[PDB]
Design a protein around this ligand. Sequence first.
Ligand SMILES: OC[C@@H]1O[C@@H](OCCCCCC2CCCCC2)[C@@H](O)[C@@H](O)[C@@H]1O[C@@H]1O[C@H](CO)[C@@H](O)[C@@H](O)[C@H]1O
Ligand SMILES: OC[C@H]1O[C@@H](O[C@@H]2[C@H](O)[C@H](O)[C@@H](OCCCCCC3CCCCC3)O[C@@H]2CO)[C@H](O)[C@H](O)[C@H]1O
Ligand SMILES: [Cl-]
Ligand code: NA
Ligand code: NA
Lengths: 490, 492, 524
Amino acid sequence: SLNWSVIVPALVIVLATVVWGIGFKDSFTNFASSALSAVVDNLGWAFILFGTVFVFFIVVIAASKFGTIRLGRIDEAPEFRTVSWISMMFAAGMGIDLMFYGTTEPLTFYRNGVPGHDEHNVGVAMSTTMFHWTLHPWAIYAIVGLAIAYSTFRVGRKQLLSSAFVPLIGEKGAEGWLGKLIDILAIIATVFGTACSLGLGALQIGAGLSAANIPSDWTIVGIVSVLTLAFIFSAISGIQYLSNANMVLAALLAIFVFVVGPTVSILNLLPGSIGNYLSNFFQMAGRTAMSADGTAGEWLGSWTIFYWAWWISWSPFVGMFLARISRGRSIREFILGVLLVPAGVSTVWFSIFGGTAIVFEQNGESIWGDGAAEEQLFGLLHALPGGQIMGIIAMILLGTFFITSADSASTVMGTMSQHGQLEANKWVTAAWGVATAAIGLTLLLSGGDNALSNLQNVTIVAATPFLFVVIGLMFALVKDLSNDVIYLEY
Amino acid sequence: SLNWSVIVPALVIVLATVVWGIGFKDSFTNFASSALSAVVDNLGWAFILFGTVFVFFIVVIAASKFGTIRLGRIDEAPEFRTVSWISMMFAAGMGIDLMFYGTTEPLTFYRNGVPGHDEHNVGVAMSTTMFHWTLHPWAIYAIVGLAIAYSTFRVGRKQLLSSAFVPLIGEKGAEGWLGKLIDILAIIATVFGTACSLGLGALQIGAGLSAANIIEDPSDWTIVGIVSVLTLAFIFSAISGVGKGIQYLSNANMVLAALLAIFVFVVGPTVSILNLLPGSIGNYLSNFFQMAGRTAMSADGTAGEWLGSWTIFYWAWWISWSPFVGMFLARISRGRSIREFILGVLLVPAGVSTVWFSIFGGTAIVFEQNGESIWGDGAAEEQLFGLLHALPGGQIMGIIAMILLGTFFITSADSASTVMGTMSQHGQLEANKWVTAAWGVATAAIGLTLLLSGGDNALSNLQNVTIVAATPFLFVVIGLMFALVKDLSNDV
Amino acid sequence: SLNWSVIVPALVIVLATVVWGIGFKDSFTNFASSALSAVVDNLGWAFILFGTVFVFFIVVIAASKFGTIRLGRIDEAPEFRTVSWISMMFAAGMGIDLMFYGTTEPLTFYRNGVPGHDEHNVGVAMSTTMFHWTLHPWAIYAIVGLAIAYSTFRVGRKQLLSSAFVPLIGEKGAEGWLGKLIDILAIIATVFGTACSLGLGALQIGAGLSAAEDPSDWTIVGIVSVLTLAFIFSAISGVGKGIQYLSNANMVLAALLAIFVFVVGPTVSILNLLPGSIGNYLSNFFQMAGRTAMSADGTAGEWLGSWTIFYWAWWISWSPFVGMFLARISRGRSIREFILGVLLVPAGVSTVWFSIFGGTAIVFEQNGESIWGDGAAEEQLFGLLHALPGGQIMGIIAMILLGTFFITSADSASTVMGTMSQHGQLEANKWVTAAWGVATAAIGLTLLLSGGDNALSNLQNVTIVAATPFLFVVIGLMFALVKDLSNDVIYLEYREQQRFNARLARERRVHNEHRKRELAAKRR
Ligand SMILES: OC[C@@H]1O[C@@H](OCCCCCC2CCCCC2)[C@@H](O)[C@@H](O)[C@@H]1O[C@@H]1O[C@H](CO)[C@@H](O)[C@@H](O)[C@H]1O
Ligand SMILES: OC[C@H]1O[C@@H](O[C@@H]2[C@H](O)[C@H](O)[C@@H](OCCCCCC3CCCCC3)O[C@@H]2CO)[C@H](O)[C@H](O)[C@H]1O
Ligand SMILES: [Cl-]
Ligand code: NA
Ligand code: NA
């Protein structure tokens, strides 16, 4: 039974964008690049303040008595081995996002410097990206992951975000407004969040193509068309297979750069980027548009605030995944797992790519070149022996990522587009994929030169509504837990 | 029971110094500016070290099992309500200075910079101000007020500074060599503290009168015209019982303070004041230790004088109010829990202050940034109003800022003038009106007395003297830190 | 009993290194300098990373439930009682360098500045030295001293060091390709280190004996002979515990010239440096823990090579003797009580030591009276106290100090190396221990010839290069210390009770939601 009460109000907005954006582009590119400014100016304090509130909240919940509570029936144990569990989180924190920013993120920070500091600064270059890909995001994925796991396993509600809000709102199934609105926002967010990955991943393919068979905007459509097409072919079975073919390619690329690049230096950056990240954490936690001397405003809009929005928009999906994979875990074991494990991949993957990118800058090999993030990865690879064949596998890996990232995404979307049915309808899954690949393709076309700007801009806008929901999820979750049987028994 | 035995040495010493101030003169203006510089040069290390140990100690103790143990028989609903339990604490410890320094403190640090930092650093500016007004001070308040509220409302010992040390002292020798000298220092430092913070506070009101009185602050006419309205503003708030006086007075003060802050928040630079919430907190945590460890040995041995004007002076300043502030914080929490009490005198005056400073100092800095500075000549008393007048409805709001200056002083005087009578009556919670009104009119006398040297000066002088006289107290809070653990331990 | 499959191949390599130094040099000198220049370069990242991990590990372990697990059978009271307990730990712990470094290292960082900072940074100066001399080096010790203490006393195996790896590789089958090689490295690393510390220790005594004029040579060979004779005796006067006299005497003396430079020198400038040092330390903690050769801007390669990475790789080489020696003394003390007697206390005295000595050295530097004498660490100690009322008179006890401060690291060391030669026993046994002592001195003054200073300076470099695998040992010792610790009866009994309570409570719960759910069907 497809809950149309949600499917359509979320299809109105998804279509409206792929309507007043693709053809009627002027009003789109304009409205977007000003609406993004509206929220970053008056709501940046929100993304920032609550962004670190999540990391605290979630840590104190782990350390709380709630930690011993078991996501499932009383004294229930896990469905999988711990190491099997961990390896599903290692692969959980991997994909387009790390491909695209792995090289340019720390690079840009080193080359252009950071508000509150100066250029050519490794420590700050590294600890800043650590900031963007470690504790902060996964706290959000933990908040949403936990809320879902708890409501669907421990209390046996529907696997919908709306359900996690029962303690506060419900008010029955919280139906009508709110319950529907929460899940409606959950859908929208998931779409644009993944549309932001499918998008820039598609324009990292294009840039990669300029390293073999060889800017024509048409190609981007050509790219998306084939990938979104393979998405439909492989949505009839699969994800479990390619998500395993991803970890070989990715490991091949990383292990490659690690050996064939400045091995010792990359290694140096492990303790470095972790030691810096802990030293600067709160300084970074304290950067708003008021620093540095009312100057760090613009930067924050293009990094810290963007990411924050993107992480929050991707929490309905990633939250589902973790919950769906952590049944039987204690709340404490869950939190610590979701925080510490995924961040291991980030830390390493950035030290591998962004690490050698920094070393090339210092040694005059600079792979910057016109400063187009999209074509920086291949810039890196090419500077390494055998990096001409690696630059291709890098594309084939982005290709496979695109698909799987859209399989898993749409599954979760179908799941919440019909009363939280785990049994995903193979049609309502595909219907959400090509719909996501639409706005992914829309943000690319509507911008051209900028592209990446609007691709980051609108997601910042599609996410801001859902920020307040995650914020409320903190309240909906302390109530559930303090009303738990075990906690009332202790 | 008019204790007695200790009032003699007090009254005569508070009298001897006030004669040294109006009589000999100069030789007393010599002491203040040299004695203070003496303690700050030598005991400086002991203020900033045990200053950060005071903070980690109450945190550890509140997070410990002892946090759960109530401060009563076991079942005893708190005498006063919640939002007033708080109001009373904040509005009793905090003086008038929060009114001005909320603007000056941040603005100054921004303009000039602080040791080991370049100027115009917004983060460092908010951080250092918080470091001075948030966690640290309210720790050297909690530690005293807790030791007391426990020594009495849980053990039973008379509400006296000597009883809290019983677990260390001869357990009854708290009425001899030390016991006496402690209750004496506690009243001498409580009389002086209230003395100058009264008359000298009346001067702040003088300059504050810039949109109303408009000079020349009729030399002494309006200064005495303020000391009168002020002295005859409390003394009744105290003797009329906390019920309508202290309690209701402190709740009004908070509502107006709240009201004023909300004004400059909405009409002022909102999204900026809003950004300085994470900015201030984040920078605070980020800078906490490097400033917890800023000593006169940095930078390269230069911050000594800056510390002498700020950090250290404050630690001595607050240590100088603990006697009568911790005494009032205990009496307002009959059946409060140690854990809640602590995170009720720490984790809320800190919140309040952080919001306060971010709103006022944040605005002062947003103006300074857009070239529309409100520094003007650099006087504290006028910066606040200069800040207000710059906003629509500023002149109007100026008058309720004036009301706030009075209330912010009086709520501290009336509340602290009750404790003057209690520690002069063997430690009676309830005190005779004729004694708590005598100690309020015997300080207004010495405060109004030092208005003979033209004005100010001697008031600021004896202030500094009170600090060097209340310096022994730093060692009290260290030891009180010991006679609270080796007392909470011998519980049940 | 004696282990002639460990003690034998130990001597065959401690002698092949002799020939390397004396009968060759160059190939010795150059290699000894080209080797650590590779472990610093290639394994530096790991020294740095795990050095900080160590600190956290035994800190959580301490505050953990494993915390109150007595070191030895449940009852059992301390064998020495405190005071002298931590007193001798600091004795086997910090050599003669705490003297000629506790004063010159704060000054050198202040005067030359530290990577990522300007010079004359009093904060960073006190900050960085603590980083090298407090929490990070004593973690390396407590971990080793814990694995071993728990292993021998609580469980009940040999004092031998590979008795801590039975948890990972066999109840005793950990004997062959590994285990005995761990013992063989330990016995080697101890012989070398106790030898160099004797040669370079000696070369210093004289270079510092110019306090209260003649150079060195020969009249310095007589100095090593009063030490190599005083640390071997020891042996008796215990029995085997003459260490108490000396070790527990480094308080009255060291506290004496400490309280001297404290009251005579700039008392307030030191006092101020107490919060200044702690505060700054905590503040720069993770910054320093993050500092590698890729920061700053790819520049701090050499400074770390000369300072931090060399320090870490140095404490890891020393870890065996201290870890082993820290095993006893601690018998009958909580995992917690032991972790705080190896961390907080030594870290607390080192702070005050650096504040007073290294502190005034920074103060004189500020007022113009620089103590920096051509950059010689030897004189700088004496050159400083010479500038104080009682300069020569204290320079004497400072000289008696650097003398006793050495033999405490040799008398205990010998005790240990002798223990790891006789199947890990705890009794004196005069010789063997004394046999390891004289044989230690052999290289001390044999290396000294044909090579000059480079002899002991390159040997003590090689000692490290052949002790770097120990890094990995202290890494794995974490996995053993916890895999072992978690099989403790008191603990197994603890969690087993928790498991039962989880089941039982669930039983009560699940039988109530039945009663009241049908009891609530009675209210149809
Ligand atoms: O998930 C296990 C939990 O572990 C403890 O805390 C959380 C585990 C911390 C380690 C997390 C790491 C694992 C993943 C990778 C990095 C992080 C307790 O809260 C405990 O109550 C909890 O469960 C414990 O394990 C027993 C095994 O069934 C339980 O029966 C329960 O009694 C408890 O002892
Ligand atoms: O650009 C580097 C390439 O040239 C050589 O470099 C060596 C090697 O990388 C050599 O491995 C390196 O030092 C070794 C690092 C030791 C750390 C050991 C870890 C390595 C892999 C993870 C587990 C253990 O130093 C050199 C400089 O990088 C290598 O031989 C490789 O061909 C390749 O790494
Ligand atoms: Cl449970
Ligand atoms: Na007040
Ligand atoms: Na020693």
